[PDB]
Design a protein around this ligand. Structure first.
Ligand code: 52P
Ligand code: BOG
Length: 326
């Protein structure tokens, strides 16, 4: 394919002629994104240029992790790859990676909604999340900026968009043994924000965050306190449930019920994505024959400590072996 090279905000962009009208959209810690017109399909696409993929072992592993993940994601409510490319002709000159996906045009942060909107948006997050969780993946950072949305309200989960507010309390306590329901806590927070037009737990730090959570959900019972190893955490928690019905007064009572089953302190007793999809609140959208699960996903590389050249070679193999969707 014939590549062409141009400069957008001091960043060099070298892409196939397939992609036209490159327009800068923004950036993150892990790269920069342009909007572009895909002449092959006539659709608009988001192109992400990874910034310095192989600067370090951690960058190299992060690059591999992203490419491997997005190659696996094949679902309507989850970001996947239309294309992956590098201007490098060989492994020896391999130093850039570009990822291409279908463009939605907005995130959930740039969007007080009606109840039907909330039903549809949250249903799509949970449908996508069921698929993600079925591959034994935990997102760990669900928040509005990691949810890409259409102008007809279709939603896809992103891995990194353009945080503590939506984090499960056990992550704040640094438990390290997280259940997948950490993502369901995050969904609970987002859902509440959409309904009420305001952040549920706008903590100023990780400590204030727990205070705000405790004010709504109540102090943990005896059964939860005995699971907390940290003497400091236990001393802070004990040195301090609101009627959800009233906190979310005016909302759909089925929306309030679901929210009570998501924002549960005990991660064991939180509703799963698959369980939440069958809640009466989503009766208009729930179709158990169209809520698919994922092919098992090999994350065994995550426990490996490899050199940059090894990560880099493995990333290159995954670029060359990429087969686009139909
Ligand atoms: O609509 C989008 N669709 C996809 N992405 N992807 C990314 S990152 C990315 C990931 C995988 C790709 F193949 C390519 C990538 F760029 C970032 C934003 C984005 C948007 C978007 C836009 Cl264009 C504007 C405002 C807010 C958002 Cl969430
Ligand atoms: C400040 C509010 C108190 C937070 C209590 C969080 C309880 C989280 O729940 C706990 O999650 C752990 C990690 O997945 C599991 O090991 C436990 O079984 C579970 O009870």
């Amino acid at each position: 394919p014939t590549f062409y090279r141009q400069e957008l905000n001091k960043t060099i962009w070298e892409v196939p002629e397939r992609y036209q009208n490159l327009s800068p959209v923004g950036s993150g810690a892990y790269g920069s994104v342009c909007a572009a017109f895909d002449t092959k399909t006539g659709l608009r696409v988001a192109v992400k240029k990874l910034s310095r993929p192989f600067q370090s072992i951690i960058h190299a592993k992060r690059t591999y992790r992203e490419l491997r993940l997005l190659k696996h994601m094949k679902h309507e409510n989850v970001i996947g790859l239309l294309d992956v490319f590098t201007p490098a002709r060989s492994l020896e000159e391999f130093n850039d990676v570009y990822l291409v996906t279908h463009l939605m045009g907005a995130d959930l942060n740039n969007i007080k909604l009606t109840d039907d909107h909330v039903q549809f948006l949250i249903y799509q997050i949970l449908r996508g999340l069921k698929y993600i969780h079925s591959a034994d993946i935990i997102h760990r950072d669900l928040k509005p900026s990691n949810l890409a949305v259409n102008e007809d309200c279709e939603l896809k989960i992103l891995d990194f968009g353009l945080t503590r507010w939506y984090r499960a309390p056990e992550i704040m306590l640094n438990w390290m043994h997280y259940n997948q329901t950490v993502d369901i806590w995050s969904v609970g927070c987002i859902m509440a924000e959409l309904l009420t037009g305001r952040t549920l737990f706008p903590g100023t730090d990780h400590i204030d965050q727990l205070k705000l959570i405790l004010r709504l959900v109540g102090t943990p019972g005896a059964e939860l306190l005995k699971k907390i190893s940290s003497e400091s955490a236990r001393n802070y928690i004990q040195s301090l449930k609101m009627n959800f019905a009233n906190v979310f007064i005016g909302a759909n009572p089925l929306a309030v019920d679901l929210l009570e089953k998501m924002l549960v302190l005990d991660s064991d007793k939180r509703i799963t994505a698959a369980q939440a999809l069958a809640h009466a609140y989503f009766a208009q959208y729930h179709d158990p024959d169209d809520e698919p699960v994922a092919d098992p996903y090999d994350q065994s590389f995550e426990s490996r400590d490899l050199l940059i050249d090894e990560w880099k070679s493995l990333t290159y193999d995954e670029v060359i072996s990429f087969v686009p969707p139909p």
